């Protein structure tokens, strides 16, 4: 048995406590959140087809206190529907509470709450950028392996109302048809190259004509003309992605054909950025809600 309502209540009760207060879930409760959410992820498409109204959120990176603040502003589930774009863990103080609340809400509201995979939701990255160490401190390495099985089953992209393409990183020179996303089978790792890598790792660059090299040591950059051609080919209006710190929490690219969202304010106490979420209403009006107070980009190959 998973007492899901007890877990959620305990996760939410620290909202009135000192910042950074941990939540005392058991190992078996956390394993239950991973196993039941994994089953739900596998039962839904890898390319989600979603309908507004929806609130779309970017990286969180274990800033649990800020996640609670974001839910307070946007409305706690199920008052609003949510889509998160990945990067739930690593590079913050409370990855465990963050991912546990997200997974609990996925289980409780499986048709109203959605999580995509970011590049930190894979073993080779979150082994070193903090999540493995956090799991080891609080629980054990076996629990990190259980989270990895759950992360290996996350969906990769979403299309909202046939008009907003959502993913963590960005476009891929290998992405010619949406069927190529749908054909990816789970559980899977994130490869060091190819379509699934690029969806989680690539970045827009205004100075690139076409595709370029990415200084993270993996994947590509892509220019405004790539965005325009992709939207035209697929009859889409917007790419919504995350994966980069931006000062206002949101930042447009390519004459508002792409937006980057980033939802962790004052990222890891080193940057002066806001965190934002984008609300899409039933008429497809998009609006922003901001929580306002390089070295920030994660890289591949740190082990090599």
């Amino acid at each position: 048995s998973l007492n899901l309502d007890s877990i959620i209540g305990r996760l939410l009760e620290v909202q009135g406590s000192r910042p950074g207060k941990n939540v005392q879930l058991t190992e078996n409760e956390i394993r239950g959140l991973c196993l039941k959410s994994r089953e739900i992820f596998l039962s839904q498409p890898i390319l989600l087809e979603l309908e507004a109204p929806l609130k779309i959120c970017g990286d969180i990176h274990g800033q649990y206190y800020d996640l609670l603040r974001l839910f307070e502003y946007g409305g706690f589930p199920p008052e609003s529907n949510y889509l998160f774009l990945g990067d739930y863990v690593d590079r913050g103080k409370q990855s465990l509470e963050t991912i546990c609340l997200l997974l609990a809400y996925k289980i409780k509201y499986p048709e109203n709450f959605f999580l995509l995979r970011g590049n930190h939701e894979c073993a080779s990255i979150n082994r070193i950028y903090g999540f493995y160490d956090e799991c080891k401190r609080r629980y054990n390495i076996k629990l990190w392996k259980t989270f990895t099985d759950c992360f290996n089953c996350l969906p990769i992209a979403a299309i909202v109302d046939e008009k907003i393409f959502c993913c963590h990183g960005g476009l891929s020179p290998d992405l010619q048809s949406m069927e190529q996303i749908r054909r990816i089978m789970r559980p899977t790792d994130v490869p060091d190259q190819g379509l699934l890598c690029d969806l989680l790792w690539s970045d827009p660059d205004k100075d690139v004509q076409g595709w370029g090299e990415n200084d993270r040591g993996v994947s590509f950059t892509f220019g405004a003309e790539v965005v325009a051609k992709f939207l035209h080919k697929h009859d889409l209006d917007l790419i919504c992605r995350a994966h980069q710190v931006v000062e206002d929490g949101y930042e447009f690219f390519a004459k508002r054909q792409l937006v980057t969202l980033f939802s962790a304010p004052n990222y890891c106490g080193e940057f002066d950025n806001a965190g934002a979420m984008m609300s899409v209403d039933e008429t497809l009006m998009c609006s922003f809600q901001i929580l306002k107070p390089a070295q920030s980009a994660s890289r591949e190959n740190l082990l090599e």
């Binding site: 206190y65 073993a123 070193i128 899977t188 790792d189 008429t283």
Partner: protein, 65 residues
């Protein structure tokens, strides 16, 4: 081509929590031997324990030991 979405011209702003967000950076504290041991650990985990669908086994990311 006809565009359906539109953007509001007004953003809502609220004050973020005021607390110390600084976190540990364990990836800056890896000796060469530590890195070799982690590459080995990840390879053994992915080759012996981590479930991957048959059609995705070509995506599994191994590290040069």
């Amino acid at each position: 081509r006809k565009i359906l979405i539109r953007f509001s011209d007004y953003v809502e702003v609220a004050d973020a929590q005021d607390y110390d967000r600084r976190a540990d950076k364990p990836w800056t504290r890896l000796t060469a031997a530590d890195k070799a041991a982690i590459r080995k650990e990840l390879n053994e985990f992915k080759s012996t324990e981590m479930e991957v669908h048959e059609l995705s086994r070509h995506l599994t990311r191994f590290h040069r030991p």
